Design a protein around this nucleic acid. Sequence first.
RNA 1: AGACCUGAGUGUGGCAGGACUACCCGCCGAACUUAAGCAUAUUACUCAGCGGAGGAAAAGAAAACAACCGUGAUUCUCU
RNA 2: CCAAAGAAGGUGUUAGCCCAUUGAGCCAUAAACCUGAGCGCCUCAUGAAUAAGCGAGUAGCACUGUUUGGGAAUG
RNA 3: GAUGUGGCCUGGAGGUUAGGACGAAGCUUAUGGCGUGAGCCUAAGAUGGACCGGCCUCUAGUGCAGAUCUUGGUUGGCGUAGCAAAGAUCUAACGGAGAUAUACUCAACAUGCAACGUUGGAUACUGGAGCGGGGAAGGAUUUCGUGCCAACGGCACUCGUACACGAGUUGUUCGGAAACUGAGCACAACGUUAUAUCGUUUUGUUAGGAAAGUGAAGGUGUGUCGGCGGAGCUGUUCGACUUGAAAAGGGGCAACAGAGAACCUGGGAUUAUAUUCCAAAAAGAAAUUGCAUGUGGGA
RNA 4: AACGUGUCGCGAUGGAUGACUUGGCUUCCUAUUUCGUUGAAGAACGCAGUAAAGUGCGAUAAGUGGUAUCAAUUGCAGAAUCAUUCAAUUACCGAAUCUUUGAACGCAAACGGCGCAUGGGAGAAGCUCGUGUCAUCCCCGUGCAUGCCAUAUUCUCAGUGUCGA
Lengths: 96, 124, 50, 81
Amino acid sequence: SNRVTVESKDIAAFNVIRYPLTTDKAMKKIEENNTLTFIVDSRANKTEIKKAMRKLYQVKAVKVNTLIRPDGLKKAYIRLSAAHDALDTANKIGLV
Amino acid sequence: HHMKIKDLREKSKDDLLKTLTEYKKELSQLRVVQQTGGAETRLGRIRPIRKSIARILTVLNQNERSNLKMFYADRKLRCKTPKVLRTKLTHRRRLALKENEKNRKTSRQMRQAHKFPKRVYAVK
Amino acid sequence: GRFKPLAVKKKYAKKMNQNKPVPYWIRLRTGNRIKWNEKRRHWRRTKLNY
Amino acid sequence: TKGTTSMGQRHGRTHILCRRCGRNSYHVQWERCAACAYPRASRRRYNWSVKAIKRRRTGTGRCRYLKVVNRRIANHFKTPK
RNA sequence: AGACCUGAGUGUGGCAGGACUACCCGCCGAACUUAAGCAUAUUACUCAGCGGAGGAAAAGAAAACAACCGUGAUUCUCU
RNA sequence: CCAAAGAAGGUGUUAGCCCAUUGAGCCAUAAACCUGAGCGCCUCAUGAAUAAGCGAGUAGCACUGUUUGGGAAUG
RNA sequence: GAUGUGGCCUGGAGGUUAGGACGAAGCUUAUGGCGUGAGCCUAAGAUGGACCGGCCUCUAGUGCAGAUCUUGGUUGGCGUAGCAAAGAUCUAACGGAGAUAUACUCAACAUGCAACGUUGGAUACUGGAGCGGGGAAGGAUUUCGUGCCAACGGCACUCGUACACGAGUUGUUCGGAAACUGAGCACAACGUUAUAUCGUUUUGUUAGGAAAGUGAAGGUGUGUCGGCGGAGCUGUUCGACUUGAAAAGGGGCAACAGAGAACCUGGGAUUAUAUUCCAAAAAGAAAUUGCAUGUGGGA
RNA sequence: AACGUGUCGCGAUGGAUGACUUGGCUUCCUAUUUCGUUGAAGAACGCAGUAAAGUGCGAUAAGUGGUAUCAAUUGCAGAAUCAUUCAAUUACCGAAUCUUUGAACGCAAACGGCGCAUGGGAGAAGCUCGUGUCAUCCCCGUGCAUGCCAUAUUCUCAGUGUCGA
Ligand SMILES: [K+]
Ligand SMILES: [K+]
Ligand SMILES: [K+]
Ligand SMILES: [K+]
Ligand SMILES: [Mg+2]
Ligand SMILES: [Mg+2]
Ligand SMILES: [Mg+2]
Ligand SMILES: [Mg+2]
Ligand SMILES: [Mg+2]
Ligand SMILES: [Mg+2]
Ligand SMILES: [Mg+2]
Ligand SMILES: [Mg+2]
Ligand SMILES: [Mg+2]
Ligand SMILES: [Mg+2]
Ligand SMILES: [Mg+2]
Ligand SMILES: [Mg+2]
Ligand SMILES: [Mg+2]
Ligand SMILES: [Mg+2]
Ligand SMILES: [Mg+2]
Ligand SMILES: [Mg+2]
Ligand SMILES: [Mg+2]
Ligand SMILES: [Mg+2]
Ligand SMILES: [Mg+2]
Ligand SMILES: [Mg+2]
Ligand SMILES: [Mg+2]
Ligand SMILES: [Mg+2]
Ligand SMILES: [Mg+2]
Ligand SMILES: [Mg+2]
Ligand SMILES: [Mg+2]
Ligand SMILES: [Mg+2]
Ligand SMILES: [Mg+2]
Ligand SMILES: [Mg+2]
Ligand SMILES: [Mg+2]
Ligand SMILES: [Mg+2]
Ligand SMILES: [Mg+2]
Ligand SMILES: [Mg+2]
Ligand SMILES: [Mg+2]
Ligand SMILES: [Mg+2]
Ligand SMILES: [Mg+2]
Ligand SMILES: [Mg+2]
Ligand SMILES: [Mg+2]
Ligand SMILES: [Mg+2]
Ligand SMILES: [Mg+2]
Ligand SMILES: [Mg+2]
Ligand SMILES: [Mg+2]
Ligand SMILES: [Mg+2]
Ligand SMILES: [Mg+2]
Ligand SMILES: [Mg+2]
Ligand SMILES: [Mg+2]
Ligand SMILES: [Mg+2]
Ligand SMILES: [Mg+2]
Ligand SMILES: [Mg+2]
Ligand SMILES: [Mg+2]
Ligand SMILES: [Mg+2]
Ligand SMILES: [Mg+2]
Ligand SMILES: [Mg+2]
Ligand SMILES: [Mg+2]
Ligand SMILES: [Mg+2]
Ligand SMILES: [Mg+2]
Ligand SMILES: [Mg+2]
Ligand SMILES: [Mg+2]
Ligand SMILES: [Mg+2]
Ligand SMILES: [Mg+2]
Ligand SMILES: [Mg+2]
Ligand code: NA
Ligand code: NA
Ligand code: NA
Ligand SMILES: [Zn+2]
């Protein structure tokens, strides 16, 4: 192989999920829709966002909706399964 | 509360890789602090953590390249060395005649040089 | 309109992020020469045509 | 008539952004750039515009690698013992 | 059967393409202008155009000058 | 008062002596470079004490074209 | 038009001799004196704040009133020409600093005018080929909320497509691509050109042109079956692994209105998105691919 | 009268002049001084606690490492130590990193698109005893343009070419 750089497999999910959003719209979706809002890698995937959510937060996502914002960033609307509570994981994440 | 370069160099690959994960996780938690207000003491920790990740990766890549260099330094595997590990120099210098080839001589040229060597002399 | 290439959309995104005034603390630096952003853009004055 | 009224008859684009130089000189229909001649392998370079040559020559950009190799040459490719 | 001649396929190891281009090497190559007009001429074996190198390039070891009591690869300087 | 240092910058007015400069000298060095063609070892190379030919679609020449100070023709 | 001038002036150089924080250069003048003049010098600054004068010689990008001269600024015209197509606004209340804003005299008018936004009424216009509701091209945050009124919206604004801050664009089925061909393009190939940055390249179709790596059937092993006679054996069907029929004419782009294409209602679901969001009674009802498992039936 | 005119003192508008100069122009010199498929020049995105431009840098992103040097940087803030060093800051450079592209070269392209090989990774279906394994789907690495040269433990072939069996 012509590529010899060491790449860690346990840190890929940290690039996929960057940070949550705490806007007024984002907080509304947590309560009535069990949905978390995140800024994700702009080249990331809906399938890969689901896997990253499992690794980083040990929650199961039933649906991921993505959009590329007008400022160039990619935002993900992640609905967690009814087994998990979005408010509870939001407290664990630290956004409350 | 960062990583010092001295103790990173006596760690193994697994301990370095394990340490890299903890700092990546800590940085990701600090990104949440950036968005949701955040105390200014915590925001001052982002740069030290980011440099620690760079230090860990620097040691990992330095060790890997040095190891692969002596692995392919063997007699039989030298010709199969990846081009990323070969000496860079310059495109022209790599293709230029080496000193050994540039200095090649014919049999007649060698005999002439030995028969009539250049001398050292002076005039009174 | 609705259609644009993603590369065009990303160029317009960068122009949007650059269309900001100078932060106030910049003007308080020791050897500062910047008073206002001289490359401010308005959609009615100058066009980008991406 | 020609003039103000015909200015409103101008629709579409002749040129879009070029992948190689980003100059908005890529002829959409002819599929080539008026500024750098992309996708031709060699660029446009004419001595009747020395001013245009100086706008695009080496050193007008970043020289990300040329800076490094110049230092290596100036230091005779120094390597550790 | 096989050979060797010609020509293919693939594996293995390499090289070319682009940039720069002040100076240098090869080609291509105008006109304005001057001639108190203008066509040969001049501008000029120049500009523009197309190629190719290097720290220089090109040239270079006599199928050379001379006509002398002879000189002695190439390049450059005064003349 | 210094000067083998007057040297031209800085410092709140015009500075040899307020600061930095201005010299012998000291320390450290991938390779390369220079030095009884520096100096050892192994290996490998190496010096000294009878006739024949010599560059062919080449040189010439003719016509045309071009270039040259080169003119019954310089390339 | 020629020439002369111990003739004048400007920026620098080699010399010489001076001045300046007790104030250099520059600038200002009913500051006078000197010179025929170019100019020189002094005075004052209720100017300035750090350099600079004389004389000899040297030197040059060395003297401005005009070139429809160049650049910057200013200026009368001049509070002038005008700001007249698209019919139009009125009223009360609320909001706002934008008022009912006052020496004397004085009951109110004759001394704070004129102008704003919102809401309710009134009146009118657009009149479905609309100052209606959605899209393409083009634009790219103008969208939304809050705040704000220096500049800008040629009058005005408390308003704004202005400014500031903070938000907003959610798809298995919608459009595109994946994945069609068209007028066409021109990579490869070949040829040409001193030079490829030239030409050919859909009239079924590249190239003097060996451009197919795909594979019927077999043979040979494996897996799921079948039948026969005595869990195995022979033969056999069908999928996986290892002999070669026939398939001429390289690789690609070009349609967001042609071809193609599996979703459509309800919502109390937004400040701004929605056949894109809604979560167990999904408000819900479907349709479609790709894999699988089990059941039923064949092999 | 009023407009208007002239002079002087003081103001405004307007930015000349002088002094200042980390800039330009011109001349001269010194070199183990000359890029790129080991992917250049150029172009595009991004990166700071705070960061629009510019500068520097590349997901290790106003920088990692190593040598010196010796206490800062500085608008604010933050910061173990007040420092032999392991963490100040500068300077230099041997070790590294180096996103999308571009000669750009797997195929394309107003498409952050789509492949064929070969390595991996994650896999809540299914099988297995929450552990293993893992279909479809998804993510990442490397190879894969054309031409030419050399080569083949002496690789596989073609020709009513020339022979020979
Ligand atoms: K000539
Ligand atoms: K006189
Ligand atoms: K003017
Ligand atoms: K062509
Ligand atoms: Mg997505
Ligand atoms: Mg979407
Ligand atoms: Mg539109
Ligand atoms: Mg557009
Ligand atoms: Mg038209
Ligand atoms: Mg018409
Ligand atoms: Mg057209
Ligand atoms: Mg087209
Ligand atoms: Mg002329
Ligand atoms: Mg003439
Ligand atoms: Mg004439
Ligand atoms: Mg004439
Ligand atoms: Mg030329
Ligand atoms: Mg030389
Ligand atoms: Mg030579
Ligand atoms: Mg000679
Ligand atoms: Mg001084
Ligand atoms: Mg010294
Ligand atoms: Mg010796
Ligand atoms: Mg001869
Ligand atoms: Mg001949
Ligand atoms: Mg001639
Ligand atoms: Mg001739
Ligand atoms: Mg002739
Ligand atoms: Mg001058
Ligand atoms: Mg003097
Ligand atoms: Mg006066
Ligand atoms: Mg006067
Ligand atoms: Mg004088
Ligand atoms: Mg003049
Ligand atoms: Mg004047
Ligand atoms: Mg005039
Ligand atoms: Mg006026
Ligand atoms: Mg009027
Ligand atoms: Mg009018
Ligand atoms: Mg009207
Ligand atoms: Mg009303
Ligand atoms: Mg009143
Ligand atoms: Mg009133
Ligand atoms: Mg009507
Ligand atoms: Mg009507
Ligand atoms: Mg009607
Ligand atoms: Mg309408
Ligand atoms: Mg609005
Ligand atoms: Mg107005
Ligand atoms: Mg705005
Ligand atoms: Mg904003
Ligand atoms: Mg034809
Ligand atoms: Mg066609
Ligand atoms: Mg074709
Ligand atoms: Mg044909
Ligand atoms: Mg197409
Ligand atoms: Mg369209
Ligand atoms: Mg259609
Ligand atoms: Mg569709
Ligand atoms: Mg809307
Ligand atoms: Mg690269
Ligand atoms: Mg490509
Ligand atoms: Mg290509
Ligand atoms: Mg034969
Ligand atoms: Na333009
Ligand atoms: Na030495
Ligand atoms: Na009027
Ligand atoms: Zn271009």
